[PDB]
Amino acid sequence: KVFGRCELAAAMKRHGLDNYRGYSLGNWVCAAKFESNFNTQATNRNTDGSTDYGILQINSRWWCNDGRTPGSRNLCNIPCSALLSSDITASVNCAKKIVSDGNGMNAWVAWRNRCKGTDVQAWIRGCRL
């Protein structure tokens, strides 16, 4: 599913992401835009042989099992295909584990390079939340 900006903001708000560990809703929308272009089916293969899955490009080296990333962890306890669902619940629940892990949203390279220190409130401007 390719989400609209406000549609996704509303879904993330309902799943408890607004101010989760201090990150306003605009941070999560900005990250999703630059990670996946708001497409739940996005996959990208890394040089190391790991793959990034879904709206928040969660990586198979640590967070999910795809059956092809040798000596990987599955810290979210989900198949990586669960992250491509039109229901963002599995992605959100896994993202909450990631952002609690010590590096905050710096775990998302596109958030660090394209969202951090920008006016992220602009991503939810105009939305009925």
**85 contact choice in Na ion, Cl ion, none (CB below 5 to 8 Å, kind-dependent):** none
According to the binding rule CB under 5 A, does residue 72 interact with Na ion?
A: yes
Interface with Na ion by CB under 5 A: which range of 26-34, 60-68, 82-90, 121-129? 60-68
According to the binding rule CB under 5 A, does residue 59 interact with Na ion?
A: no
Query: Does 7 qualify as catalytic in the annotation?
Result: no
According to the binding rule CB under 5 A, does residue 57 interact with Na ion?
A: no
Smallest separation (angstroms) from Na ion to the CB of 44? 15
Judged by beta carbon, residue 72 or residue 91, the one nearer Na ion is 72
What angle separates helix 25-36 from helix 5-14, to the nearest 10 degrees?
Answer: 130
List the structure tokens of 116. Answer: 């951090």
**121 contact choice in Cl ion, Na ion, none (CB below 5 to 8 Å, kind-dependent):** Cl ion
Which residues, in sequence order, are CB contacts of 84 under 8 Å at separation 6+?
A: 40, 41, 43, 53, 54
- List the interface residues with Na ion, window 22-51 (CB under 5 A): none
List the structure tokens of 31. Answer: 């990250």
**81 contact choice in Na ion, Cl ion, none (CB below 5 to 8 Å, kind-dependent):** none
Judged by beta carbon, residue 24 or residue 74, the one nearer Na ion is 74
Contact 21, 8 (CB under 8 A): no
Burial of 70 per CB tally in 10 Å (0-12, 13-18, 19+)? exposed
How large is the C-alpha radius of gyration of the chain?
14
Give the residue numbers marked as catalytic. 35, 52
